[PDB]
Amino acid sequence: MENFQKVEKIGEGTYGVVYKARNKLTGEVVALKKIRPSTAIREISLLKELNHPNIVKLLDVIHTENKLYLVFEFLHQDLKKFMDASALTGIPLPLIKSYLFQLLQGLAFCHSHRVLHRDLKPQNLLINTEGAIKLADFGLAVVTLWYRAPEILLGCKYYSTAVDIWSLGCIFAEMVTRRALFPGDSEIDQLFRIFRTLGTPDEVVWPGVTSMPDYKPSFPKWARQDFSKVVPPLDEDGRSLLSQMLHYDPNKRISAKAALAHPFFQDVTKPVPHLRL
Ligand SMILES: COc1cccc(C(=O)c2sc(Nc3ccc(S(N)(=O)=O)cc3)nc2N)c1
């Protein structure tokens, strides 16, 4: 832009690059995403009116000279950085619980407004010094596949809100164990890592799975591993909730609204994180 002074590049998605920038006139500090369709533009408008404390605010949309700029409120750190910074000691359970609860509130909100995120990952979950966490970089209707729902990997053409619950479940597990749950480095490796842990799905647990676009009868048949080995440091309420967020059948997978009512959140609080900026 010309009305902006780039302070530094802070990220890059599969459609654009994001910079920390300052409004040369107002002096406000923002996150500016630069991207190099009636559906999109209107899909974006909807995003602008999507206001919730757990959703990064989209301030302005500027279309000029073969470039599309999205101006967002700036947050100081993403969850990936915070997790790395917390790798030696781990994020305290109360904070993990607070973050999960808040993200579920944000998803409950977008989902009730028929908005799907589609690409949740630690890098697009942003945190501030007051203990909040917000959903950022919504996806429109080397890329990381670690948080991709199985139905996407199996070729489903129509995503449902369940894909976001799956991604969030993977992130929840990662915050707890301090290791990515399914770190695949290809679509098939991602799929098979999921199968090796949760068991190769079949018609019993996932009606219709064998008729999905990319399903092959030749997939290996792995037995489901004991769930207590998956996220050991997690108590039973947490494990129960996670298992519901990771159901194979999108229709059995717990909703964000239902997840918010899970016993795991009975004692939820809002701790302040120790952030090094
Ligand atoms: C492809 O476009 C994207 C991708 C992901 C997020 C956003 C986005 O809206 C952002 S990023 C941000 N600040 C920030 C991010 C990471 C870090 S770090 N690495 O912890 O030092 C520090 C500050 N604020 C907003 N609002 C845009």
mmCIF file with all atom_site columns, all heavy atoms in Angstrom, residues 10 12-13 16 18 31 33 56 72-78 81 123-124 126 136-137, ligand 1:
data_model
loop_
_atom_site.group_PDB
_atom_site.id
_atom_site.type_symbol
_atom_site.label_atom_id
_atom_site.label_alt_id
_atom_site.label_comp_id
_atom_site.label_asym_id
_atom_site.label_entity_id
_atom_site.label_seq_id
_atom_site.pdbx_PDB_ins_code
_atom_site.Cartn_x
_atom_site.Cartn_y
_atom_site.Cartn_z
_atom_site.occupancy
_atom_site.B_iso_or_equiv
_atom_site.pdbx_formal_charge
_atom_site.auth_seq_id
_atom_site.auth_comp_id
_atom_site.auth_asym_id
_atom_site.auth_atom_id
_atom_site.pdbx_PDB_model_num
ATOM   1   N N   . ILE A 1 10  ? 5.263   -10.622 8.614  1.00 0.00 ? 10  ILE A N   1
ATOM   2   C CA  . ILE A 1 10  ? 5.060   -11.471 9.782  1.00 0.00 ? 10  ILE A CA  1
ATOM   3   C C   . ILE A 1 10  ? 4.444   -12.827 9.463  1.00 0.00 ? 10  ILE A C   1
ATOM   4   O O   . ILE A 1 10  ? 4.269   -13.660 10.352 1.00 0.00 ? 10  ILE A O   1
ATOM   5   C CB  . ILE A 1 10  ? 4.181   -10.765 10.838 1.00 0.00 ? 10  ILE A CB  1
ATOM   6   C CG1 . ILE A 1 10  ? 2.806   -10.449 10.259 1.00 0.00 ? 10  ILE A CG1 1
ATOM   7   C CG2 . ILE A 1 10  ? 4.850   -9.483  11.293 1.00 0.00 ? 10  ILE A CG2 1
ATOM   8   C CD1 . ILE A 1 10  ? 1.877   -9.743  11.236 1.00 0.00 ? 10  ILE A CD1 1
ATOM   9   N N   . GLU A 1 12  ? 2.712   -15.653 5.992  1.00 0.00 ? 12  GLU A N   1
ATOM   10  C CA  . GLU A 1 12  ? 2.370   -15.917 4.606  1.00 0.00 ? 12  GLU A CA  1
ATOM   11  C C   . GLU A 1 12  ? 1.410   -17.095 4.504  1.00 0.00 ? 12  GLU A C   1
ATOM   12  O O   . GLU A 1 12  ? 1.682   -18.176 5.030  1.00 0.00 ? 12  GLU A O   1
ATOM   13  C CB  . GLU A 1 12  ? 3.650   -16.204 3.817  1.00 0.00 ? 12  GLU A CB  1
ATOM   14  C CG  . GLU A 1 12  ? 3.485   -16.206 2.312  1.00 0.00 ? 12  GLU A CG  1
ATOM   15  C CD  . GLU A 1 12  ? 4.818   -16.093 1.596  1.00 0.00 ? 12  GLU A CD  1
ATOM   16  O OE1 . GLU A 1 12  ? 5.537   -15.097 1.843  1.00 0.00 ? 12  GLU A OE1 1
ATOM   17  O OE2 . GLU A 1 12  ? 5.148   -16.991 0.791  1.00 0.00 ? 12  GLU A OE2 1
ATOM   18  N N   . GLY A 1 13  ? 0.281   -16.872 3.837  1.00 0.00 ? 13  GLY A N   1
ATOM   19  C CA  . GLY A 1 13  ? -0.708  -17.921 3.668  1.00 0.00 ? 13  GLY A CA  1
ATOM   20  C C   . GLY A 1 13  ? -0.609  -18.548 2.290  1.00 0.00 ? 13  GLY A C   1
ATOM   21  O O   . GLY A 1 13  ? 0.407   -18.399 1.608  1.00 0.00 ? 13  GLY A O   1
ATOM   22  N N   . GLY A 1 16  ? -1.917  -15.180 0.230  1.00 0.00 ? 16  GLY A N   1
ATOM   23  C CA  . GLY A 1 16  ? -1.324  -13.872 0.446  1.00 0.00 ? 16  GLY A CA  1
ATOM   24  C C   . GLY A 1 16  ? -0.275  -13.787 1.538  1.00 0.00 ? 16  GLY A C   1
ATOM   25  O O   . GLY A 1 16  ? -0.030  -14.748 2.264  1.00 0.00 ? 16  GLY A O   1
ATOM   26  N N   . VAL A 1 18  ? 1.189   -11.488 4.911  1.00 0.00 ? 18  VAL A N   1
ATOM   27  C CA  . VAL A 1 18  ? 0.751   -10.531 5.917  1.00 0.00 ? 18  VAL A CA  1
ATOM   28  C C   . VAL A 1 18  ? 1.920   -9.753  6.517  1.00 0.00 ? 18  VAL A C   1
ATOM   29  O O   . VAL A 1 18  ? 2.978   -10.311 6.810  1.00 0.00 ? 18  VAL A O   1
ATOM   30  C CB  . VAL A 1 18  ? -0.065  -11.227 7.036  1.00 0.00 ? 18  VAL A CB  1
ATOM   31  C CG1 . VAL A 1 18  ? 0.788   -12.255 7.753  1.00 0.00 ? 18  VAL A CG1 1
ATOM   32  C CG2 . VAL A 1 18  ? -0.609  -10.180 8.004  1.00 0.00 ? 18  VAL A CG2 1
ATOM   33  N N   . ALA A 1 31  ? -2.446  -5.375  10.915 1.00 0.00 ? 31  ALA A N   1
ATOM   34  C CA  . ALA A 1 31  ? -1.884  -6.500  10.179 1.00 0.00 ? 31  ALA A CA  1
ATOM   35  C C   . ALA A 1 31  ? -2.471  -6.301  8.787  1.00 0.00 ? 31  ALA A C   1
ATOM   36  O O   . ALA A 1 31  ? -3.690  -6.187  8.626  1.00 0.00 ? 31  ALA A O   1
ATOM   37  C CB  . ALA A 1 31  ? -2.348  -7.817  10.762 1.00 0.00 ? 31  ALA A CB  1
ATOM   38  N N   . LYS A 1 33  ? -2.770  -7.867  5.027  1.00 0.00 ? 33  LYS A N   1
ATOM   39  C CA  . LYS A 1 33  ? -2.586  -9.030  4.179  1.00 0.00 ? 33  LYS A CA  1
ATOM   40  C C   . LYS A 1 33  ? -2.721  -8.578  2.732  1.00 0.00 ? 33  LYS A C   1
ATOM   41  O O   . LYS A 1 33  ? -3.705  -7.943  2.364  1.00 0.00 ? 33  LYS A O   1
ATOM   42  C CB  . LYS A 1 33  ? -3.631  -10.098 4.483  1.00 0.00 ? 33  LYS A CB  1
ATOM   43  C CG  . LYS A 1 33  ? -3.390  -11.387 3.709  1.00 0.00 ? 33  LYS A CG  1
ATOM   44  C CD  . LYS A 1 33  ? -4.489  -12.405 3.945  1.00 0.00 ? 33  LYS A CD  1
ATOM   45  C CE  . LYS A 1 33  ? -4.157  -13.708 3.227  1.00 0.00 ? 33  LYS A CE  1
ATOM   46  N NZ  . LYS A 1 33  ? -5.163  -14.760 3.520  1.00 0.00 ? 33  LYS A NZ  1
ATOM   47  N N   . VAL A 1 56  ? -10.603 -12.301 14.909 1.00 0.00 ? 56  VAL A N   1
ATOM   48  C CA  . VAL A 1 56  ? -9.810  -11.110 14.572 1.00 0.00 ? 56  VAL A CA  1
ATOM   49  C C   . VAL A 1 56  ? -10.673 -10.160 13.734 1.00 0.00 ? 56  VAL A C   1
ATOM   50  O O   . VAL A 1 56  ? -11.312 -10.576 12.764 1.00 0.00 ? 56  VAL A O   1
ATOM   51  C CB  . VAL A 1 56  ? -8.507  -11.500 13.804 1.00 0.00 ? 56  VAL A CB  1
ATOM   52  C CG1 . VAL A 1 56  ? -7.717  -10.254 13.413 1.00 0.00 ? 56  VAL A CG1 1
ATOM   53  C CG2 . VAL A 1 56  ? -7.627  -12.374 14.697 1.00 0.00 ? 56  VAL A CG2 1
ATOM   54  N N   . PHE A 1 72  ? -6.480  -5.909  9.105  1.00 0.00 ? 72  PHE A N   1
ATOM   55  C CA  . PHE A 1 72  ? -6.973  -6.530  10.323 1.00 0.00 ? 72  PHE A CA  1
ATOM   56  C C   . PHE A 1 72  ? -6.383  -5.868  11.549 1.00 0.00 ? 72  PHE A C   1
ATOM   57  O O   . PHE A 1 72  ? -5.306  -5.265  11.495 1.00 0.00 ? 72  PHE A O   1
ATOM   58  C CB  . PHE A 1 72  ? -6.549  -8.000  10.378 1.00 0.00 ? 72  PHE A CB  1
ATOM   59  C CG  . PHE A 1 72  ? -7.147  -8.848  9.314  1.00 0.00 ? 72  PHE A CG  1
ATOM   60  C CD1 . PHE A 1 72  ? -6.406  -9.176  8.187  1.00 0.00 ? 72  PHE A CD1 1
ATOM   61  C CD2 . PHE A 1 72  ? -8.439  -9.345  9.445  1.00 0.00 ? 72  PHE A CD2 1
ATOM   62  C CE1 . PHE A 1 72  ? -6.943  -9.996  7.201  1.00 0.00 ? 72  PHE A CE1 1
ATOM   63  C CE2 . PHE A 1 72  ? -8.983  -10.166 8.468  1.00 0.00 ? 72  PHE A CE2 1
ATOM   64  C CZ  . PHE A 1 72  ? -8.232  -10.492 7.347  1.00 0.00 ? 72  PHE A CZ  1
ATOM   65  N N   . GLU A 1 73  ? -7.097  -5.993  12.658 1.00 0.00 ? 73  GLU A N   1
ATOM   66  C CA  . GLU A 1 73  ? -6.593  -5.486  13.923 1.00 0.00 ? 73  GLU A CA  1
ATOM   67  C C   . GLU A 1 73  ? -5.348  -6.349  14.169 1.00 0.00 ? 73  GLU A C   1
ATOM   68  O O   . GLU A 1 73  ? -5.327  -7.533  13.816 1.00 0.00 ? 73  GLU A O   1
ATOM   69  C CB  . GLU A 1 73  ? -7.608  -5.724  15.039 1.00 0.00 ? 73  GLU A CB  1
ATOM   70  C CG  . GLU A 1 73  ? -7.885  -7.184  15.297 1.00 0.00 ? 73  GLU A CG  1
ATOM   71  C CD  . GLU A 1 73  ? -8.662  -7.445  16.578 1.00 0.00 ? 73  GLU A CD  1
ATOM   72  O OE1 . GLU A 1 73  ? -8.287  -6.901  17.641 1.00 0.00 ? 73  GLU A OE1 1
ATOM   73  O OE2 . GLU A 1 73  ? -9.645  -8.205  16.530 1.00 0.00 ? 73  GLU A OE2 1
ATOM   74  N N   . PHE A 1 74  ? -4.321  -5.765  14.772 1.00 0.00 ? 74  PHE A N   1
ATOM   75  C CA  . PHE A 1 74  ? -3.066  -6.476  15.031 1.00 0.00 ? 74  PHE A CA  1
ATOM   76  C C   . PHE A 1 74  ? -3.007  -7.124  16.410 1.00 0.00 ? 74  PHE A C   1
ATOM   77  O O   . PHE A 1 74  ? -3.366  -6.496  17.401 1.00 0.00 ? 74  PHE A O   1
ATOM   78  C CB  . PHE A 1 74  ? -1.893  -5.486  14.896 1.00 0.00 ? 74  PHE A CB  1
ATOM   79  C CG  . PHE A 1 74  ? -0.535  -6.087  15.166 1.00 0.00 ? 74  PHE A CG  1
ATOM   80  C CD1 . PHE A 1 74  ? 0.152   -6.778  14.160 1.00 0.00 ? 74  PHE A CD1 1
ATOM   81  C CD2 . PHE A 1 74  ? 0.073   -5.945  16.414 1.00 0.00 ? 74  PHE A CD2 1
ATOM   82  C CE1 . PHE A 1 74  ? 1.431   -7.318  14.388 1.00 0.00 ? 74  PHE A CE1 1
ATOM   83  C CE2 . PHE A 1 74  ? 1.349   -6.476  16.657 1.00 0.00 ? 74  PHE A CE2 1
ATOM   84  C CZ  . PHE A 1 74  ? 2.031   -7.160  15.647 1.00 0.00 ? 74  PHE A CZ  1
ATOM   85  N N   . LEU A 1 75  ? -2.594  -8.391  16.464 1.00 0.00 ? 75  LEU A N   1
ATOM   86  C CA  . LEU A 1 75  ? -2.403  -9.082  17.743 1.00 0.00 ? 75  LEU A CA  1
ATOM   87  C C   . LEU A 1 75  ? -0.905  -9.350  17.810 1.00 0.00 ? 75  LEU A C   1
ATOM   88  O O   . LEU A 1 75  ? -0.267  -9.480  16.781 1.00 0.00 ? 75  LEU A O   1
ATOM   89  C CB  . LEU A 1 75  ? -3.251  -10.361 17.837 1.00 0.00 ? 75  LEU A CB  1
ATOM   90  C CG  . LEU A 1 75  ? -4.638  -9.989  18.393 1.00 0.00 ? 75  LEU A CG  1
ATOM   91  C CD1 . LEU A 1 75  ? -5.575  -9.619  17.244 1.00 0.00 ? 75  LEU A CD1 1
ATOM   92  C CD2 . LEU A 1 75  ? -5.219  -11.136 19.214 1.00 0.00 ? 75  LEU A CD2 1
ATOM   93  N N   . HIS A 1 76  ? -0.326  -9.427  19.009 1.00 0.00 ? 76  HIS A N   1
ATOM   94  C CA  . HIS A 1 76  ? 1.124   -9.564  19.091 1.00 0.00 ? 76  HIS A CA  1
ATOM   95  C C   . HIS A 1 76  ? 1.831   -10.882 18.954 1.00 0.00 ? 76  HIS A C   1
ATOM   96  O O   . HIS A 1 76  ? 3.059   -10.905 18.804 1.00 0.00 ? 76  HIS A O   1
ATOM   97  C CB  . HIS A 1 76  ? 1.638   -8.885  20.359 1.00 0.00 ? 76  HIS A CB  1
ATOM   98  C CG  . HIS A 1 76  ? 1.715   -7.397  20.245 1.00 0.00 ? 76  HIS A CG  1
ATOM   99  N ND1 . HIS A 1 76  ? 0.597   -6.591  20.269 1.00 0.00 ? 76  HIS A ND1 1
ATOM   100 C CD2 . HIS A 1 76  ? 2.776   -6.569  20.085 1.00 0.00 ? 76  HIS A CD2 1
ATOM   101 C CE1 . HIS A 1 76  ? 0.967   -5.331  20.130 1.00 0.00 ? 76  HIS A CE1 1
ATOM   102 N NE2 . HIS A 1 76  ? 2.283   -5.291  20.018 1.00 0.00 ? 76  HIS A NE2 1
ATOM   103 N N   . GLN A 1 77  ? 1.101   -11.987 18.988 1.00 0.00 ? 77  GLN A N   1
ATOM   104 C CA  . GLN A 1 77  ? 1.784   -13.265 18.864 1.00 0.00 ? 77  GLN A CA  1
ATOM   105 C C   . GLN A 1 77  ? 0.808   -14.340 18.431 1.00 0.00 ? 77  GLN A C   1
ATOM   106 O O   . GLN A 1 77  ? -0.386  -14.214 18.687 1.00 0.00 ? 77  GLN A O   1
ATOM   107 C CB  . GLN A 1 77  ? 2.396   -13.638 20.210 1.00 0.00 ? 77  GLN A CB  1
ATOM   108 C CG  . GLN A 1 77  ? 3.317   -14.855 20.193 1.00 0.00 ? 77  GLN A CG  1
ATOM   109 C CD  . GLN A 1 77  ? 4.242   -14.865 21.395 1.00 0.00 ? 77  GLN A CD  1
ATOM   110 O OE1 . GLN A 1 77  ? 5.193   -14.070 21.475 1.00 0.00 ? 77  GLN A OE1 1
ATOM   111 N NE2 . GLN A 1 77  ? 3.962   -15.743 22.347 1.00 0.00 ? 77  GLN A NE2 1
ATOM   112 N N   . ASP A 1 78  ? 1.308   -15.376 17.755 1.00 0.00 ? 78  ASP A N   1
ATOM   113 C CA  . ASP A 1 78  ? 0.426   -16.471 17.360 1.00 0.00 ? 78  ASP A CA  1
ATOM   114 C C   . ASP A 1 78  ? 0.673   -17.657 18.285 1.00 0.00 ? 78  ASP A C   1
ATOM   115 O O   . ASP A 1 78  ? 1.669   -17.701 19.028 1.00 0.00 ? 78  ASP A O   1
ATOM   116 C CB  . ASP A 1 78  ? 0.588   -16.872 15.876 1.00 0.00 ? 78  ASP A CB  1
ATOM   117 C CG  . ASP A 1 78  ? 1.990   -17.371 15.524 1.00 0.00 ? 78  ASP A CG  1
ATOM   118 O OD1 . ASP A 1 78  ? 2.534   -18.253 16.214 1.00 0.00 ? 78  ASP A OD1 1
ATOM   119 O OD2 . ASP A 1 78  ? 2.541   -16.885 14.520 1.00 0.00 ? 78  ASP A OD2 1
ATOM   120 N N   . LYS A 1 81  ? 4.020   -19.721 17.949 1.00 0.00 ? 81  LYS A N   1
ATOM   121 C CA  . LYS A 1 81  ? 5.164   -19.137 18.639 1.00 0.00 ? 81  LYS A CA  1
ATOM   122 C C   . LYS A 1 81  ? 5.063   -19.354 20.144 1.00 0.00 ? 81  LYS A C   1
ATOM   123 O O   . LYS A 1 81  ? 6.048   -19.711 20.795 1.00 0.00 ? 81  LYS A O   1
ATOM   124 C CB  . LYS A 1 81  ? 5.280   -17.638 18.339 1.00 0.00 ? 81  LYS A CB  1
ATOM   125 C CG  . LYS A 1 81  ? 6.482   -16.969 19.004 1.00 0.00 ? 81  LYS A CG  1
ATOM   126 C CD  . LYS A 1 81  ? 6.741   -15.600 18.367 1.00 0.00 ? 81  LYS A CD  1
ATOM   127 C CE  . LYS A 1 81  ? 7.943   -14.885 18.954 1.00 0.00 ? 81  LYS A CE  1
ATOM   128 N NZ  . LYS A 1 81  ? 8.111   -13.534 18.316 1.00 0.00 ? 81  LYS A NZ  1
ATOM   129 N N   . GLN A 1 123 ? -0.590  -21.303 13.712 1.00 0.00 ? 123 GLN A N   1
ATOM   130 C CA  . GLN A 1 123 ? -0.142  -20.057 13.106 1.00 0.00 ? 123 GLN A CA  1
ATOM   131 C C   . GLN A 1 123 ? -1.245  -19.036 12.856 1.00 0.00 ? 123 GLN A C   1
ATOM   132 O O   . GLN A 1 123 ? -0.951  -17.843 12.724 1.00 0.00 ? 123 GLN A O   1
ATOM   133 C CB  . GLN A 1 123 ? 0.628   -20.325 11.804 1.00 0.00 ? 123 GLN A CB  1
ATOM   134 C CG  . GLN A 1 123 ? 2.060   -20.762 12.025 1.00 0.00 ? 123 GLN A CG  1
ATOM   135 C CD  . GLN A 1 123 ? 2.881   -20.729 10.753 1.00 0.00 ? 123 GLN A CD  1
ATOM   136 O OE1 . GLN A 1 123 ? 4.102   -20.874 10.788 1.00 0.00 ? 123 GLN A OE1 1
ATOM   137 N NE2 . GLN A 1 123 ? 2.214   -20.538 9.620  1.00 0.00 ? 123 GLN A NE2 1
ATOM   138 N N   . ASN A 1 124 ? -2.505  -19.469 12.780 1.00 0.00 ? 124 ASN A N   1
ATOM   139 C CA  . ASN A 1 124 ? -3.549  -18.467 12.611 1.00 0.00 ? 124 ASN A CA  1
ATOM   140 C C   . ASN A 1 124 ? -4.480  -18.294 13.810 1.00 0.00 ? 124 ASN A C   1
ATOM   141 O O   . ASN A 1 124 ? -5.609  -17.822 13.675 1.00 0.00 ? 124 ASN A O   1
ATOM   142 C CB  . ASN A 1 124 ? -4.353  -18.639 11.312 1.00 0.00 ? 124 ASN A CB  1
ATOM   143 C CG  . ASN A 1 124 ? -4.942  -19.998 11.146 1.00 0.00 ? 124 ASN A CG  1
ATOM   144 O OD1 . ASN A 1 124 ? -5.474  -20.592 12.089 1.00 0.00 ? 124 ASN A OD1 1
ATOM   145 N ND2 . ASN A 1 124 ? -4.887  -20.501 9.909  1.00 0.00 ? 124 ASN A ND2 1
ATOM   146 N N   . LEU A 1 126 ? -4.400  -16.264 17.172 1.00 0.00 ? 126 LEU A N   1
ATOM   147 C CA  . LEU A 1 126 ? -3.618  -15.155 17.721 1.00 0.00 ? 126 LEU A CA  1
ATOM   148 C C   . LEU A 1 126 ? -3.971  -14.819 19.150 1.00 0.00 ? 126 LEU A C   1
ATOM   149 O O   . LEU A 1 126 ? -5.143  -14.836 19.519 1.00 0.00 ? 126 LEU A O   1
ATOM   150 C CB  . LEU A 1 126 ? -3.823  -13.912 16.857 1.00 0.00 ? 126 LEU A CB  1
ATOM   151 C CG  . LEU A 1 126 ? -3.696  -14.188 15.360 1.00 0.00 ? 126 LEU A CG  1
ATOM   152 C CD1 . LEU A 1 126 ? -4.096  -12.937 14.577 1.00 0.00 ? 126 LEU A CD1 1
ATOM   153 C CD2 . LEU A 1 126 ? -2.266  -14.635 15.039 1.00 0.00 ? 126 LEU A CD2 1
ATOM   154 N N   . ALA A 1 136 ? -8.035  -16.256 13.156 1.00 0.00 ? 136 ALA A N   1
ATOM   155 C CA  . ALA A 1 136 ? -7.556  -15.375 12.099 1.00 0.00 ? 136 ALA A CA  1
ATOM   156 C C   . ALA A 1 136 ? -7.353  -16.120 10.793 1.00 0.00 ? 136 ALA A C   1
ATOM   157 O O   . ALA A 1 136 ? -7.360  -17.350 10.759 1.00 0.00 ? 136 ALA A O   1
ATOM   158 C CB  . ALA A 1 136 ? -6.244  -14.714 12.512 1.00 0.00 ? 136 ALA A CB  1
ATOM   159 N N   . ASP A 1 137 ? -7.168  -15.351 9.726  1.00 0.00 ? 137 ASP A N   1
ATOM   160 C CA  . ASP A 1 137 ? -6.927  -15.874 8.383  1.00 0.00 ? 137 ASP A CA  1
ATOM   161 C C   . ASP A 1 137 ? -7.922  -16.936 7.921  1.00 0.00 ? 137 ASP A C   1
ATOM   162 O O   . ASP A 1 137 ? -7.544  -18.051 7.552  1.00 0.00 ? 137 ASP A O   1
ATOM   163 C CB  . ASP A 1 137 ? -5.495  -16.405 8.292  1.00 0.00 ? 137 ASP A CB  1
ATOM   164 C CG  . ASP A 1 137 ? -5.012  -16.540 6.852  1.00 0.00 ? 137 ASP A CG  1
ATOM   165 O OD1 . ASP A 1 137 ? -5.393  -15.705 6.010  1.00 0.00 ? 137 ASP A OD1 1
ATOM   166 O OD2 . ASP A 1 137 ? -4.238  -17.468 6.574  1.00 0.00 ? 137 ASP A OD2 1
HETATM 167 C C1  . LIG B 2 .   ? -1.853  -14.934 5.473  1.00 0.00 ? 1   LIG B C1  1
HETATM 168 O O1  . LIG B 2 .   ? -2.315  -13.989 6.293  1.00 0.00 ? 1   LIG B O1  1
HETATM 169 C C2  . LIG B 2 .   ? -2.409  -14.134 7.682  1.00 0.00 ? 1   LIG B C2  1
HETATM 170 C C3  . LIG B 2 .   ? -1.995  -15.369 8.347  1.00 0.00 ? 1   LIG B C3  1
HETATM 171 C C4  . LIG B 2 .   ? -2.099  -15.492 9.805  1.00 0.00 ? 1   LIG B C4  1
HETATM 172 C C5  . LIG B 2 .   ? -2.606  -14.386 10.561 1.00 0.00 ? 1   LIG B C5  1
HETATM 173 C C6  . LIG B 2 .   ? -3.023  -13.141 9.908  1.00 0.00 ? 1   LIG B C6  1
HETATM 174 C C7  . LIG B 2 .   ? -3.534  -12.011 10.746 1.00 0.00 ? 1   LIG B C7  1
HETATM 175 O O2  . LIG B 2 .   ? -4.776  -11.508 10.562 1.00 0.00 ? 1   LIG B O2  1
HETATM 176 C C8  . LIG B 2 .   ? -2.668  -11.432 11.821 1.00 0.00 ? 1   LIG B C8  1
HETATM 177 S S1  . LIG B 2 .   ? -1.081  -11.987 12.110 1.00 0.00 ? 1   LIG B S1  1
HETATM 178 C C9  . LIG B 2 .   ? -0.954  -10.831 13.390 1.00 0.00 ? 1   LIG B C9  1
HETATM 179 N N1  . LIG B 2 .   ? 0.131   -10.616 14.203 1.00 0.00 ? 1   LIG B N1  1
HETATM 180 C C10 . LIG B 2 .   ? 1.168   -11.471 14.526 1.00 0.00 ? 1   LIG B C10 1
HETATM 181 C C11 . LIG B 2 .   ? 1.295   -12.860 14.016 1.00 0.00 ? 1   LIG B C11 1
HETATM 182 C C12 . LIG B 2 .   ? 2.374   -13.686 14.398 1.00 0.00 ? 1   LIG B C12 1
HETATM 183 C C13 . LIG B 2 .   ? 3.380   -13.171 15.301 1.00 0.00 ? 1   LIG B C13 1
HETATM 184 S S2  . LIG B 2 .   ? 4.599   -14.106 15.755 1.00 0.00 ? 1   LIG B S2  1
HETATM 185 N N2  . LIG B 2 .   ? 4.949   -15.118 14.625 1.00 0.00 ? 1   LIG B N2  1
HETATM 186 O O3  . LIG B 2 .   ? 4.109   -14.924 17.053 1.00 0.00 ? 1   LIG B O3  1
HETATM 187 O O4  . LIG B 2 .   ? 5.895   -13.175 16.107 1.00 0.00 ? 1   LIG B O4  1
HETATM 188 C C14 . LIG B 2 .   ? 3.280   -11.806 15.807 1.00 0.00 ? 1   LIG B C14 1
HETATM 189 C C15 . LIG B 2 .   ? 2.194   -10.971 15.428 1.00 0.00 ? 1   LIG B C15 1
HETATM 190 N N3  . LIG B 2 .   ? -2.050  -10.086 13.570 1.00 0.00 ? 1   LIG B N3  1
HETATM 191 C C16 . LIG B 2 .   ? -3.020  -10.415 12.688 1.00 0.00 ? 1   LIG B C16 1
HETATM 192 N N4  . LIG B 2 .   ? -4.217  -9.799  12.685 1.00 0.00 ? 1   LIG B N4  1
HETATM 193 C C17 . LIG B 2 .   ? -2.918  -13.031 8.455  1.00 0.00 ? 1   LIG B C17 1
#
